[PDB]
Amino acid sequence: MTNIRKSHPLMKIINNAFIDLPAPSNISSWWNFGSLLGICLILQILTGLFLAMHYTSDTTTAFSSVTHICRDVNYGWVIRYLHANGASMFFICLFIHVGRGLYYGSYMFLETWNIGVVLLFTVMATAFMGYVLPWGQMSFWGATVITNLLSAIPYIGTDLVEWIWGGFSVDKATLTRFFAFHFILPFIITALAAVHLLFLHETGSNNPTGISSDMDKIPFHPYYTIKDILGALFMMLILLILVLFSPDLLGDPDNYTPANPLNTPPHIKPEWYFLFAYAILRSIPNKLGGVLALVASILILILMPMLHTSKQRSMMFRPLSQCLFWMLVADLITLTWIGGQPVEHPFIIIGQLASILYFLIILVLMPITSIIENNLLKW
Amino acid sequence: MTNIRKSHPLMKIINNAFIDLPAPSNISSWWNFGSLLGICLILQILTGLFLAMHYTSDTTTAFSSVTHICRDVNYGWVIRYLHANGASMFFICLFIHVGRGLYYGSYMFLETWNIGVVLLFTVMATAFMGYVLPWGQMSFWGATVITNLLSAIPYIGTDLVEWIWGGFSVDKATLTRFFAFHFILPFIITALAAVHLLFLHETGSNNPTGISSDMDKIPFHPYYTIKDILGALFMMLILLILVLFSPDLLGDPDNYTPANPLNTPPHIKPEWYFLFAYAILRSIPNKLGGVLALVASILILILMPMLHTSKQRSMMFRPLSQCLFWMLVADLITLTWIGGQPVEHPFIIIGQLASILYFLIILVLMPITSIIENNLLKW
Amino acid sequence: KGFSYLITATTTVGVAYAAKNAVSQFVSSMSASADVLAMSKIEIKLSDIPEGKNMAFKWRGKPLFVRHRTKKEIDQEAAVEVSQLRDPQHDLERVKKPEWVILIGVCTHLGCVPIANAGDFGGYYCPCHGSHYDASGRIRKGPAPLNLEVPTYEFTSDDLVIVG
Amino acid sequence: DLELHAPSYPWSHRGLLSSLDHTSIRRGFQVYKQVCSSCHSMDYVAYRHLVGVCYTEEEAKALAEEVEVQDGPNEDGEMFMRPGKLSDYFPKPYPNPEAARAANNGALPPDLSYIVRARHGGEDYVFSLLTGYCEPPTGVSLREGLYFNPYFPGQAIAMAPPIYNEVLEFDDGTPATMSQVAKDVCTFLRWASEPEHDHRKRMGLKMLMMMGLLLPLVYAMKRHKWSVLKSRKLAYRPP
Amino acid sequence: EMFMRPGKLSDYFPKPYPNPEAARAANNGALPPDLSYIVRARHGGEDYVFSLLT
Amino acid sequence: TLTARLYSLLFRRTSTFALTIAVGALFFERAFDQGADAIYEHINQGKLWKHIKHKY
Amino acid sequence: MLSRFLGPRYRELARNWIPTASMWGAVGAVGLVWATDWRLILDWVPYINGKF
Amino acid sequence: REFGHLTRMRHVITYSLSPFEQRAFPHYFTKGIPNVLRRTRACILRVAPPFVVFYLVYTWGTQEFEKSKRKNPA
Ligand code: HEC
Ligand code: HEM
Ligand code: HEM
Ligand code: HEM
Ligand code: HEM
């Protein structure tokens, strides 16, 4: 006789995944966000399904269908705002997870780090694409701007924007193809998340100290289930606070207007989780260089495993690196704020300077600070 | 240092699932229908996505959207008819696969068999959902009849039909929810197919003789990859002939008429792969009895491992049982033809006898015949 | 070995041809459909449009004015400076052939349609919030932020002028 | 009761790799626009589709220019007349279904964009229905204003006889024989519900030859790789 | 023919102008925005619209 | 044997094997397209649109 | 890294693998031109420019 | 279930030849045709009857439907 928990194949996989998987005891709350992301994935996908059950992707019905969901459908407004604020919370958790990975040297798990970068790319694409679906003024106009950014690509680039648009500009074909891709992509995210978990489970998670915790490992089920339950409950507390008291808080009011291609909005801006890289795009004058900087602003995460030079993996014992990391976080907040604001004086200079400081901190200040760090500790 | 094929995490799974998996040396072509099914998934999923990028689910414009796909999109008709006939071939290959499993005694693998039954239910519901989407006369009316079939459930029955069917009649909400479920389900089918292979692998495979083939296992990659490639190319032959010479061979022409709730078509039949149950529905006069018999027609598969009385797993050395199995197949084609025909004097009695003979073979004739052969073989 | 691998080579080239002739089908399927090609990007205009007129047509998704700018209004547009314009755009880059002006029909302030032969300067006037426009296609001043958009029209065979 | 199954006519396109007669397609569009268009609609098939299959570009431009189609809001918001173009769809009879039903006794003339692909029989059924009007036999006297068509389900159709001999003058010079007119319009409808027939049979040819090459070669590769297994001389030498 | 009947609970709110171009041509060329989502579309909400009216 | 020269030159290296396959595709696509189109027009002479534009 | 790849035998490996990698590059370029039907290149080659 | 914990076997010798030395179709027709004929002879005796009785049932049902749908003299 043998345990069904660790002899049945599905149950054996689940057991080795999150029942009897050894875990560091000193894991802080910063790791809970990982599970939160998974929760914020499922809570998204399910809701999306219900939205897809009352959404008719067409330039003559998209806004009307969304309105019909909001008003007429029994408890449809709650699903819609749940979806929007859940995407926002998903990006909050994603950014916090990336910050944790940077802080505690979690990028030493190279395969997991690269798979996470791919997941992050896919999530940005999914959210950008999904924001088109309500077909508001902001949706259509922002989509036009972002897709037209691909015209800067040399040679083929112009043809590409005709290919993505499904024609001469963003129209019904673009809307329906965006709907289809928005449907398919989250399942690719789920598969990539499974692969990301496999890679991490091969080596095990990293404690805040950075030292290997093989000597002190605790089973996952008795402890790190209820802790993740508490984390998910707190995330739900925040998310339903947003949905039930300030539904259209982060979303721009201009979306609640039929997409009229005869009137440019006063300011065309993406989501708050998109304004930082869009501000980076704004900063560079050259169009092609702008797109290169925009893509590099996220692709630079892959370079992080190579740029690490300090002998300590984590940052608990590197105060100078901690100050640099917080300078980077403040710089990202400045990028978001600048992206919100129009490209005028002095926002132009502030955005440019913060854009340079972003790459300068990531590529230069952190490694040089790490060299000084090693020199300061006899090694 | 070490081979990446058997050391990399994902590559290890791929290696021991498809490259170096020890497969029986003498599996016939009938086993190849496994791989085709998976291919018939991917080949049909990729097409299915491309229709989702030109198909608006609104009832007032679903049929016009389908006509626009077939008439305006570059090579749209190829995708549309490839999708339809790929679903038809998926059901052909599914029936052949179930016939193989029942024949060569593979249904003794338990977990894989039940998972296969669940997969059959999922895809068989998915095709029914997909047929409604074009919103033709047969699509709408067959959906009406099949959904109203559920009203025979006692007490809560109508309420369930009030819920699944959107109340009212098959109308705007029904089309959207059918599209959403049609989209979500095949990914569940993919996950369940992965679980199906996972349950299959630790048992190996059932060779035609039914004896354990642990003394003749051969690597998968050199031989069975090219064998399944040739099989998939033959399935390409049949699918392309169907798609490219007689696109609407396995289809009702009245589906090319926009759905009208004000006119019942002279004949109300589902697709060809559903009639084998539809006729069973007409066999029992009672509505609830019809529901139970129609469900049991597929539920009887999980009872097959219990109803195995022969001492030999396989069917090659059981001629009397072979005659019974081929009688079962002939009864299946007879049931399909009867479901095709309307309900008059020549067809009612034939359908009743066919359903009775179906059940009598599966639960009665086959075990008794197996016992007779066991006695006739001195064991 | 040569024969055994020639079999494989011929199989592979056939499979490559099939793979291209399928993936190209799919890629062109996601590309622009025939309806948008044959409804939107075809704007032949006959020279029936006489001097000093603005018969406007709703193409793509916006109207467009085909101005037959006569010699008089041409020399007013020439005389009007460039520098104090809100977004300086000289008539040269505004329009290729002086006799005909091609420009969109949606005022950039909030939309609507500018009525022609009005707006103090003479050319255009959007009455929604009273924005007068420069006759050459620009704006001299007013509530509207920037000048009227000019499409990628082509002047080939002046009798039959196509707009892209 | 009963029903006539339409006899299998020897259509030029009935061949496995035989295409449509595009001249017949043009002459069948002419009859559609002359007599059929007065009461029937084709909706999806547009003037642009005719270019490159039955009519040249300028001929189709003139064809669309002949008819006046209704265009959107005027500068005052009035729903005004306008000459047709290639982008326009085939102009339709009486606007809403209710007017069409009221004008045509109490029957709605179905759209022909899919009528040859929506009826069991297709071209054979359509041709037989058109050239099958017969005097009602004894004892089956139908309504007033009804017409006996044996091939029509119910044997009682609401058509004034559509095609009678010498109704339309073909531009090419073909005689106005009722059979000629019916065959031409039937071919036009087959093109209408299958606007890929030529290219579909072209793909059929290409796929047939491609895999007539591919199957022997892939099979040869399979036998080449499997040949080790299919020639394993086994042995058994117990001590 | 399009017949006129007394409105019922099923009907939505009446639209004063038949088509938008008629509305623009009627007033001055400007389009009165749809009042359904007007409050949720303008930065400021009700405090905006009220401030406008007064 | 000519096959021996083929294996010695174009087939020994898998990379030049890929080059041979690619150039074979280059020529074979055009050859197959031209031949199949010629056969198609030969079967349906005086029926396709290509065989009738001469009048118009 | 930088110095550990900067050796004599490493440049020997580079010289050995220059032909195969270089003409793999030609394989890729020809495949790209083929797949995209690049008229800029395909026009010059004979017997294929007829397709245009 | 990977190679090695499969079974225990003793005194078994397997001779195999390179795929580049055997013809891919050794006596394709002259040997395949008798084998296919033998397989057909073995299987048809139990395969054909259930399918042929379906054919008589189908023909009987079709003619029964057409004769019952016809009018009777009365
Ligand atoms: C002046 C009137 C009129 C003309 C001319 C006319 N039709 Fe009709 N047609 C009708 C009406 C009314 C019906 C509806 C009858 C019914 O319910 O089937 C109809 C029905 C049909 C149907 C449906 C038959 C079915 O199976 O239900 C077809 C096909 C058809 N017409 C084809 C044609 C063709 C082809 C032509 C000329 C080349 C033509 N018609 C000319 C009025 C007309
Ligand atoms: C990866 C998780 C997902 C993210 C980040 C995401 C993101 C978004 C966003 C930002 C919107 C726009 C919300 C708004 O209108 O303000 C949206 C809309 C939509 N999404 Fe998703 N989505 C996700 C998953 C899904 C899934 C799995 C489906 C399909 C089942 C789906 C279907 C829809 C639909 C139908 C809409 C339009 C309704 C609406 O805009 O409110 N989403 N999505
Ligand atoms: C789709 C969203 C994501 C999901 C569902 C996900 C899932 C998880 C989970 C559950 C963990 C374990 C808990 C934890 O360590 O936080 C984890 C760890 C990790 N993830 Fe992610 N992740 C996602 C996105 C990312 C991103 C964007 C990155 C960065 C590129 C990333 C890199 C990592 C790293 C480095 C670890 C290890 C952290 C450690 O061991 O301390 N992940 N992931
Ligand atoms: C279990 C696998 C599936 C089967 C058997 C299936 C089957 C079908 C069938 C038979 C139709 C009707 C086609 C017609 O009447 O011409 C249909 C419609 C449709 N299916 Fe699926 N489907 C499947 C999965 C999917 C997936 C994964 C997608 C999206 C990626 C999809 C998208 C559609 C769409 C958009 C339609 C409407 C357009 C059309 O009718 O062709 N289906 N499906
Ligand atoms: C979604 C469709 C399905 C897929 C993709 C699938 C996939 C596979 C594959 C690839 C195999 C190995 C090849 C083979 O032995 O045939 C297999 C084996 C098997 N499948 Fe399925 N299957 C499907 C549906 C089913 C169904 C409906 C059943 C029956 C309830 C079933 C039961 C089995 C059994 C019993 C085996 C073992 C065959 C043997 O080893 O003899 N599967 N499946």
Ligand code: FES
């Ligand atoms: S929209 Fe033209 S003036 Fe305001």
